[PDB]
């Protein structure tokens, strides 16, 4: 795909969940650089 | 030409990345279906990704976008989860890492919520979960996320429900 004309990306913002944060979309791989690699486990709630 | 450098848990940089991770966990509307049920992570390791070629590739595109957006790159740090993480850190992001059926268009997606990106570590919808247990909520197997520098430039605002 291509971004909207004259735009370099898309900001998707949830309108129903005020606690959900934004998501973003770029259409050129060169606009992102994988700065940190994080290794983790999810933790079971107590 | 990619090198991974371990950050120390006693390093401010490690701690800053861990806090972004932990502080952006939220609940999801699928009740944990895709990414599992959790309120926090156990961080095992944080490595800095160094590749001179991929960096200049990024800073060259950043300059173009910046000048197109009147000297404003609009650069952020954002999370990305993917089955393709090991290819990404060595070869960089490209069309193969895009989401054809994303609800904001067929591009490469990033999240402010770490738990949102966690939903994609084992694939769209969580795939079939971890390889070993086939458990999307596995508390045993190790997962990896990327925390990325992203150039947004002039970004189109789309509201979604
Ligand atoms: C859609 C979305 C929203 C927020 C974060 C993310 C994220 O962090 N990763 C991915 C997606 C995503 C969707 O595309 C997948 C690829 C493997 C197809 C990876
Ligand atoms: Zn497992």
């Amino acid at each position: 795909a291509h971004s909207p004309p004259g735009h370099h990306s898309v900001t998707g913002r949830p309108s129903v969940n005020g606690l959900a944060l934004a998501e973003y979309v770029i259409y050129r791989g060169e606009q992102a650089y994988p700065e940190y690699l994080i290794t983790y486990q999810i933790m079971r709630p107590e | 030409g990619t090198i991974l450098i371990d950050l120390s848990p006693d390093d401010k940089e490690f701690q800053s990345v861990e806090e972004e991770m932990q502080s952006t966990v939220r609940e999801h509307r699928d009740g944990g279906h895709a990414g599992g049920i959790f309120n926090r992570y156990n961080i095992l390791k944080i490595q800095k990704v160094c590749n001179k070629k991929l960096w200049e590739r990024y800073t060259h595109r950043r300059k173009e976008v910046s000048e197109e957006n009147h000297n404003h790159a609009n650069e952020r740090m954002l999370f990305h989860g993917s089955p393709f993480v090991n290819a990404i850190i060595h070869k960089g992001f490209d069309e193969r890492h895009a989401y054809i059926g994303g609800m904001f268009g067929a591009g490469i997606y990033f999240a402010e919520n770490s738990s949102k990106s966690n939903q994609y570590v084992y694939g769209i919808g969580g795939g079939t979960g971890c390889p070993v247990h086939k458990d999307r909520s596995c508390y045993i197997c190790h997962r990896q996320l990327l925390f990325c520098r992203v150039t947004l430039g002039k970004s189109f605002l789309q509201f979604s429900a």
Side-chain angles (χ1 to χ4, degrees):
Chain A
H2 291 245
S3 49
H7 289 84
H8 303 100
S9 64
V10 174
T11 299
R13 206 177 193 277
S15 53
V16 178
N17 195 358
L19 291 199
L21 302 183
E23 298 163 28
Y24 301 86
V25 183
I26 61 181
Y27 302 96
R28 302 272 309 271
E30 304 94 318
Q31 274 168 242
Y33 179 87
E35 191 131 332
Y36 301 99
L37 183 65
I38 302 166
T39 307
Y40 67 99
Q41 296 158 317
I42 58 169
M43 288 180 69
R44 188 189 296 270
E46 291 170 23
Chain B
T2 294
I3 286 169
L4 304 179
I5 303 297
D6 279 35
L7 301 177
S8 172
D10 295 323
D11 192 327
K12 298 291 258 308
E13 193 168 7
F14 181 105
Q15 296 164 10
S16 170
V17 175
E18 159 145 24
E19 182 51 21
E20 278 301 325
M21 188 90 167
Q22 302 283 14
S23 65
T24 60
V25 177
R26 63 166 172 92
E27 302 239 298
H28 290 264
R29 287 170 170 260
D30 66 7
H33 182 83
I37 299 176
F38 66 95
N39 299 309
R40 60 189 171 106
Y41 312 100
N42 181 38
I43 305 302
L44 302 166
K45 192 193 290 178
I46 300 175
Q47 293 159 307
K48 180 165 170 183
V49 179
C50 303
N51 186 303
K52 188 172 161 304
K53 192 187 72 63
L54 295 183
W55 176 244
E56 294 174 344
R57 180 184 186 235
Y58 172 75
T59 57
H60 176 270
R61 178 54 178 163
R62 183 176 64 185
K63 183 179 168 199
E64 297 182 322
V65 173
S66 183
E67 300 186 354
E68 287 185 354
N69 196 39
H70 305 111
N71 193 36
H72 178 41
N74 201 13
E75 180 178 79
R76 313 284 178 92
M77 296 299 303
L78 302 166
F79 292 104
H80 183 85
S82 173
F84 310 123
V85 168
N86 205 82
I88 293 167
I89 61 176
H90 290 285
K91 299 183 291 197
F93 284 101
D94 65 54
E95 70 191 323
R96 301 176 292 155
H97 314 306
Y99 186 17
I100 305 307
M103 65 188 331
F104 297 120
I108 304 170
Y109 283 70
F110 294 83
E112 285 173 353
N113 284 120
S114 67
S115 56
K116 168 49 76 169
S117 283
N118 176 74
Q119 289 187 313
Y120 293 90
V121 170
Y122 295 128
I124 292 169
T128 56
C130 69
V132 175
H133 302 85
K134 293 195 223 278
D135 185 355
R136 281 182 290 268
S137 191
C138 190
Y139 300 108
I140 301 174
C141 290
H142 295 182
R143 310 175 178 207
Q144 301 189 307
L145 278 181
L146 297 171
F147 193 36
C148 308
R149 190 171 298 255
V150 183
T151 298
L152 295 178
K154 167 69 93 161
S155 191
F156 180 84
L157 183 50
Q158 172 76 69
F159 288 89
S160 62

